[PDB]
Amino acid sequence: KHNMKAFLDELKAENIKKFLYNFTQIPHLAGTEQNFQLAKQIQSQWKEFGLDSVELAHYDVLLSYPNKTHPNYISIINEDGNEIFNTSLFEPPPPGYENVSDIVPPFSAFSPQGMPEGDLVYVNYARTEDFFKLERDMKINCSGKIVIARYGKVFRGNKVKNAQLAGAKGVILYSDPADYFAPGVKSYPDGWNLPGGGVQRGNILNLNGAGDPLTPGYPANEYAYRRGIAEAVGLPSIPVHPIGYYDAQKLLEKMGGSAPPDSSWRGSLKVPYNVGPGFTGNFSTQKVKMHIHSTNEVTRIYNVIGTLRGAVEPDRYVILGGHRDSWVFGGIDPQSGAAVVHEIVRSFGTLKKEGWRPRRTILFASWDAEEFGLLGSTEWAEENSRLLQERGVAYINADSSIEGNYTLRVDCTPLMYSLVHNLTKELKSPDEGFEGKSLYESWTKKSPSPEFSGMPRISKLGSGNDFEVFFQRLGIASGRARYTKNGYPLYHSVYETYELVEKFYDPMFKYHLTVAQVRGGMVFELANSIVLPFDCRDYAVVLRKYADKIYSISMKHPQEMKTYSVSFDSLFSAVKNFTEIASKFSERLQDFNPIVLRMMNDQLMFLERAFIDPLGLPDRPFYRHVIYAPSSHNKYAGESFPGIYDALFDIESKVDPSKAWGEVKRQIYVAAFTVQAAAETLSEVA
């Protein structure tokens, strides 16, 4: 028999291990020779594995690299303009790789060049709320200052955006042991903690879903028009550089001015965590000086796209995708996901060589340039948008498979809640103490739902990974699953190696295997069920929760709601109608002829599509999903009813309340209309 069990049993922990070792011996930075080589290898192997076609899709996009003969660094300078302390020019390489070439040193991709000098201000995590505190509570003025912020809590690009709007002239990012050093575990190479010389790389763009900064809306092909750098989308306007906590300690130890407003502002360094500005009396005349010399450069990137043509519905696509490019070795991010994808392609190809084909077409993708702003997935989706929006069933992401070894973590559209619950009930738990018990059982025990008894937590999708164009721009149902902790200390550091994984995370590759079963299990059911495995009633349940929540935010302002006649009645009405119509639809779907079948599967496929507004969100044309958008304060986090949420945010500070509440009302109308219109797609068609 060729069924899901056949597929799942073919998957092997030992192959995932072999592929992970194979993908992590040399750096695979986007735009480099070694990453083009790996692309070609994967293309070759996927062909050998049995896919029908495997092609490279290339694009020429804006990337960013340090200057090899002109290193980035930070200084403390004295009053004679003398550099009395310099930050490190590279991370100490891990054992046995001290002779690897082409390790890119730590930098903030897309930083402009510059050498600003000034006085430091410590901004905690540089969240929206942290800047409100500095300015509004502590009356600290960040204008003309260099801010130093610890990584964590929110996407780094949002930190740099927040810093720019507070008027900073430079940002220094560092990893505080409070956030990146787990108590009682040893630093790398002797455990999984971040050593003091380790540094987190990462881009600091604010693209809001545009993809390549020079070609928003259109693929970066051979004949593309490009914007000039000055009109590019998302580029920061102040220099930015990341450092480790040994270097951070040196910069923070002399901080004067105000003390931290509270304990939530102090990390674990032997330092006062004084907010500044400037150093204490003795050192009052010393300044901080940045030296940033990185360059932005149009560079070719390569996605690998494999097709396994469907037997019955070849014009319906289920996509499994994840990126291949890494900052250095990528032992977790992304190769722990790419190895799982490789083993899934291998299994499917094994069923294929024995004569099986899935019902629908499965597309497999190895995306490039994820680390530089989701560039590879975005440009491909821009090129193929018409095919995807009329044919795309679902997108399953496959970045890092593990970020911990405690339990499963799933983030997906409500349409796939039932699918995941059912699949995880048929999978074995890899967990200690749950031998013989289902993955569903261990997961719900270790990660219980905040809302329901006997159910696991499933989170929203935001952004910050390759599903974002498919879900947030195009409205294709999307999901992701990984193993997680109770992100991880070595994130985007040179220490993210094969050895980290094999020694400290998953020696038996059993958690990798579990993730391959969940991702592959999902793809199989999406590509093979006769009725698509979506449950519209689950969307109805969450829409009421999100309506309750946004109403509760507005109701912090009862006087204004009275004055400006702010009613949520339309939105609750729409949610009620959606609930009724989806109940009826689900009755027909079980009570219901292939055209009825094909017509009906289309209602299911286009339901996520119906939450798309073609006009996008305000000033963010590429975020079009009215229910979910990446948080405007944290790209990684999903926000519900984002348009109304952003209209309400800090509304009490707006100068013209009538206009502000008018906009809240406008956003309620758009949300209610969109929920009703989505509901109406599930009505009888004629």
Ligand X SMILES: *[C@@H]1O[C@H](CO)[C@@H](O)[C@H](O)[C@H]1NC(C)=O
Ligand Y SMILES: *[C@@H]1O[C@H](CO)[C@@H](O[C@@H]2O[C@H](CO)[C@@H](O[C@@H]3O[C@H](CO)[C@@H](O)[C@H](O[C@H]4O[C@H](CO)[C@@H](O)[C@H](O)[C@@H]4O)[C@@H]3O)[C@H](O)[C@H]2NC(C)=O)[C@H](O)[C@H]1NC(C)=O
Ligand Z SMILES: *[C@@H]1O[C@H](CO)[C@@H](O[C@@H]2O[C@H](CO)[C@@H](O)[C@H](O)[C@H]2NC(C)=O)[C@H](O)[C@H]1NC(C)=O
Spatial contact of 90 and 184, defined as CB atoms under 8 Å apart: no
Structure tokens at 508: 């038996």
Which residue, 208 or 326, has its beta carbon nearer to Zn ion? Answer: 326
Residues 169-228 that bind ligand X (CB under 6 A): 192
Residue with tokens 């031998």: 435
Residue with tokens 């209309």: 673
How many Cβ atoms from other residues are within 10 Å of residue 681's Cβ? Answer: 17
Catalytic residue list contains 187: no
Rounded least distance, CB 16 to ligand Z, Å:
14
Residue 322 makes contact with Zn ion by CB under 5 A: no
Structure tokens at 550: 């946004």
Which residue, 407 or 444, has its beta carbon nearer to ligand X? Answer: 407
Rounded least distance, CB 60 to ligand Y, Å:
8
Residues 515-534 that bind ligand Z (CB under 6 A): 533
Structure tokens at 323: 């990126």
Among 83, 315, 548, 680, binds ligand X (CB under 6 A): 83
Q: Return d(Cα 417, Cα 420) in angstroms, integer.
A: 5
From its own copies, Zn ion, ligand Y, none, which one binds at residue 609 (CB under 5 to 8 Å depending on kind)?
Answer: its own copies
Spatial contact of 483 and 225, defined as CB atoms under 8 Å apart: no
Active-site position among 625, 631, 632, 640: 625
Structure tokens at 61: 């996009």
Which residue, 211 or 256, has its beta carbon nearer to Ca ion? Answer: 211
Structure tokens at 127: 């969240």
Cα angle value 297/301/306 (rounded, 5°): 170
Give the bridge partners for 639, in sequence order: 629
Among 535, 538, 608, 646, binds ligand Z (CB under 6 A): 535
Tell me: is residue 636 an annotated ligand-binding position: yes
Spatial contact of 477 and 413, defined as CB atoms under 8 Å apart: yes
Binding segment (CB under 8 A) for its own copies, from list 83-91, 118-126, 383-391, 542-550: 383-391
DSSP 159-217: HHHHHHHTT-SEEEEE--HHHH--TT-PBTTSSSBPPTT----EE----TT--STTSTT
Binding segment (CB under 8 A) for its own copies, from list 200-208, 379-387, 403-411, 528-536: 379-387
Selection from 215, 162, 132 nearest residue 631 by Cα: 162
Catalytic residue list contains 79: no
Among 91, 130, 212, 535, binds Ca ion (CB under 5 A): 212
- Report how far apart, in Å, the C-alpha atoms of 503 and of each of 98, 176, 190 are: 19, 24, 9
Selection from 518, 64, 627 nearest residue 327 by Cα: 64
How many residues are listed for the chain in this entry?
Answer: 686
Does residue 189 have a cis bond before it (omega within 30 degrees)? Answer: yes
Q: Return d(Cα 175, Cα 183) in angstroms, integer.
A: 15
Residue 270 makes contact with its own copies by CB under 8 A: no
Residue 399 makes contact with Zn ion by CB under 5 A: yes
Q: Return d(Cα 331, Cα 323) in angstroms, integer.
A: 13
Selection from 573, 515, 567 nearest residue 543 by Cα: 573
Spatial contact of 400 and 390, defined as CB atoms under 8 Å apart: no
Can you state the angle between helices 335-353 and 33-49, rounded to 10 degrees?
30
Tell me: is residue 315 an annotated ligand-binding position: no
Which residue, 67 or 653, has its beta carbon nearer to ligand X? Answer: 67
Binding segment (CB under 6 A) for ligand Y, from list 109-117, 289-297, 566-574, 615-623: 566-574
Catalytic residue list contains 602: yes
Binding segment (CB under 6 A) for ligand X, from list 45-53, 141-149, 581-589, 637-645: 141-149
Among 274, 347, 577, 631, binds ligand Y (CB under 6 A): 577
Residue 439 makes contact with ligand Y by CB under 6 A: no
Which residue, 326 or 631, has its beta carbon nearer to ligand Z? Answer: 326
Rounded least distance, CB 615 to its own copies, Å:
5
How far separated are the first and last CA of the chain, in Å rounded? 40
Residue 69 makes contact with ligand X by CB under 6 A: yes
Residues 393-432 that bind ligand X (CB under 6 A): 404-405
- Residue 603 identity: Q
Tell me: is residue 481 an annotated ligand-binding position: yes
Tell me: is residue 460 an annotated ligand-binding position: no
Size of the site for Ca ion (CB under 5 A): 5
Among 33, 80, 98, 222, binds ligand Y (CB under 6 A): 222
Residue 333 makes contact with Zn ion by CB under 5 A: yes
From Zn ion, Ca ion, Cl ion, none, which one binds at residue 211 (CB under 5 to 8 Å depending on kind)?
Answer: Ca ion
Residue 672 makes contact with ligand Y by CB under 6 A: yes
From ligand X, its own copies, Cl ion, none, which one binds at residue 480 (CB under 5 to 8 Å depending on kind)?
Answer: Cl ion
Active-site position among 212, 313, 370, 646: 370
Catalytic residue list contains 512: no
Among 3, 9, 25, 90, binds ligand Z (CB under 6 A): 25
Q: What is the CA radius of gyration of the chain?
A: 25
Structure tokens at 264: 């939530």
Size of the site for its own copies (CB under 8 A): 53
Selection from 227, 587, 170, 132 nearest residue 160 by Cα: 170
Tell me: is residue 343 an annotated ligand-binding position: no
Q: Return d(Cα 123, Cα 147) in angstroms, integer.
A: 6
Point out the residues that are catalytic.
Answer: 370, 567, 602, 625
Chain residues that interact with ligand X, rule: CB under 6 A? 67, 69-70, 75, 83-86, 141, 143-144, 192, 293, 295, 404-405, 485, 504-505
Chain residues that interact with ligand Z, rule: CB under 6 A? 22, 25, 41, 44-45, 418-419, 422, 533, 535, 590
Annotated binding site: 156, 203, 215, 218, 323, 333, 370-371, 379, 382, 399, 463-465, 480-482, 491-492, 635-636
Annotated binding site for substrate: 156, 203, 370, 463-465, 480-482, 491-492, 635-636
